[PDB]
Subunit: 141 residues, 6 copies
Amino acid sequence: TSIDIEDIKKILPHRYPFLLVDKVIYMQPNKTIIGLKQVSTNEPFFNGHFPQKQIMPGVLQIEALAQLAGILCLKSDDSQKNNLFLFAGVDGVRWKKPVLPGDTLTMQANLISFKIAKLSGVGYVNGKVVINISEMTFALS
Amino acid sequence: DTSIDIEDIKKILPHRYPFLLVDKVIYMQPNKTIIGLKQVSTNEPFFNGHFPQKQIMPGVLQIEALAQLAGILCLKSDDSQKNNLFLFAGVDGVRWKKPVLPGDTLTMQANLISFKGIAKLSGVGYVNGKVVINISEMTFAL
Amino acid sequence: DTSIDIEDIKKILPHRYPFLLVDKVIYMQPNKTIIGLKQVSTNEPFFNGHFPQKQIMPGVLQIEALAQLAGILCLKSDDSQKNNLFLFAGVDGVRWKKPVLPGDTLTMQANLISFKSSLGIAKLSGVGYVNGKVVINISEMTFALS
Amino acid sequence: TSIDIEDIKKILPHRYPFLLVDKVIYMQPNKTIIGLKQVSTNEPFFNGHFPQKQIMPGVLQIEALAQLAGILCLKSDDSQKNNLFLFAGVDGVRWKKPVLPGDTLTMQANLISFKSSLGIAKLSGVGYVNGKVVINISEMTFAL
Amino acid sequence: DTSIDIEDIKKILPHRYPFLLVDKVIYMQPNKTIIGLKQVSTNEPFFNGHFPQKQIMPGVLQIEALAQLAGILCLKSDDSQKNNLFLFAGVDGVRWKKPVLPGDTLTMQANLISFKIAKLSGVGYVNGKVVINISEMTFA
Amino acid sequence: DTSIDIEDIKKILPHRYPFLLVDKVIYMQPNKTIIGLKQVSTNEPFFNGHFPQKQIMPGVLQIEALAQLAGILCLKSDDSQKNNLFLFAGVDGVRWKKPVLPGDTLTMQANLISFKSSLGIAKLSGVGYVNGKVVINISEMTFALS
Ligand SMILES: Clc1cccc(COc2ccc(Cl)c3cccnc23)c1
């Protein structure tokens, strides 16, 4: 079920400057989620990273995916009345290609286990893989 | 032709954050037309104020994005006057047709009409192949 | 002669930092005209980008200022629809004459021309001044109640 | 003489979001300076002070007068080629009236003493909205 | 544990970002003394302005932080006056001794002198060292 | 001493506000280990969005923090290459044990494992502490010299 940006902030507690999901285009509960984060020069981190070369910081690509991952969790089982999810561990992260101003970062997250929730995440720009995440781990606290 | 990425955009335009609204230039023909894009993310400083309860890209910011793209065109068309500080002099016939929202790609084209400094240009911006804004005439001064 | 202060403007308008650009409303007549001001300070977030070597108020933000003021008038002329989300639908005949600089007071007047409850079509003209002298002219602003 | 913001930036090292003089309207070397700071809703401190009632922080009023005091010093004597001035002391500050968005804060600073090249300048300062005193300062002391 | 973490400070002070300058209250004695801290990081908004080539914490922001700390003590000392919007009315005998820099832990103590109309003293330390003295902060 | 203060950090790292997350280097030994710290203040811009109701230091930023300290060690161990623009190639074995909060001092250690300046390729391990106690652990941080 497709989601525009007002409804994301109803699920997630993240606000500016640390909401890194712009749209949710496809979601299947307990299974997968697809979404995007538009990379514009008009974002606050870009001045710091870097003055002479504007490149999306890798860690913020993790955060992006992790957030989209967390939307899936909250919409797969919100029985625990808590939207405050905390990153507990992350493993097998590979950055292949610089994400630059102008790109669309398309993102896919797959639920492995919900016991502590564990997920994987891929990031595409132009159908080409830019980030890989073997395993994001999350523990609503 | 060749794409002018952002680092090279900042070498042409004097605009900086939080008022640089052109992310990439995909095609430019000197003295004629220019196509650019602006990626609209929730991670932009203006969104918290427009509006807290419904994030919509201010319409005047779309004009500003288009007028900056038009400005790139002018400076590469004739830099004989190597002053990059161009000021908006007039704008005419602006119609916004659809809300530009976070998640969108604002695709933009500007068209040089006349040039002498005084230059005139038309602008159009699209999201998903659909017209979001039209500008008959942007007028500019050196 | 109602004097409206930033807290009460924040009750009318859904705009917030950094895109609220009316600081005060000095005169308002419902269904007719509104006069207000915006103080122009170096200490605004837009000025670092426009421009590094020469701070000048972006003309579009002068458009926005006058629009927001105009939209105040609209919501105090007719709030029967309790929606405060007005979008810009069209603008026509905009002339910038003088540069608006840090230190200036931007006195603004918007006049209501037509108000159609058909589509939510309100139409307004707008003039901005610094020191009694015209800095911006707008022949027609068109707005759409969402 | 009147001084624009562009020239203010030539004299003062202060940059956004800590430059609090928008215009110098009258200056006399070695004696007195007059200047203004336009107070808009569109400043980054206003969200923090305070969400529910927007009041210009008093310490920022002190800063604004201090920056204006600073300009006068640098134009009264720039034999010391150093624009980086440090507040060393402040005495006799009184806030009378809340400074609000939409106000013009007109400021005046009066040089009291200058030790040329110990770098110790002393000055007084007053701030006004609408002809009415909003801030008094008995003595700013600076480390040049 | 006689202290107050950030979430609890925000229930006391109306101040928010970018003008909340107390991170943690480590000791407090009602009607007497308050000890607090503020961590000084390059990643703070004011440091780009002051100064581009030499990051120094604005002295007035040292005054503001101490005053904020003093403000918590007042309110926890007597909240019968049901108002958390305190205004600075005056400040006296402020002396800056040393620059405060990114990386320092600004440790601050404010001492209540008189109430009802509140007057207090303030001292700031980096590494035991006195960075700022305030003889008298006046509140109403 | 072996202490680099913020000014010298900014000569080594290209990072600026709001993405410079090493405040001070307290001990460094070239080609081996580095100890630095990041001061956690409520007066940082990320805290407003993470989270409104509960200010917690984004875990990812704790990675960046460590990686930037890792980078300082690499650029001082070997600056053969006239390039300070290090990109994160991959990260591995990250655990977050305890929330980092406004008021904490994040004390950080990164250790060099392997370096081949032939390619411009380095690997590092990292641990973050608050009050002597572990808050973050990182098995492997991999970085490219681009
Ligand atoms: Cl006109 C003006 C100028 C500067 C600061 C202020 C008020 O500062 C405060 C507000 C709220 C609280 Cl609860 C405080 C507490 C302590 C110190 N200052 C406080 C008023």
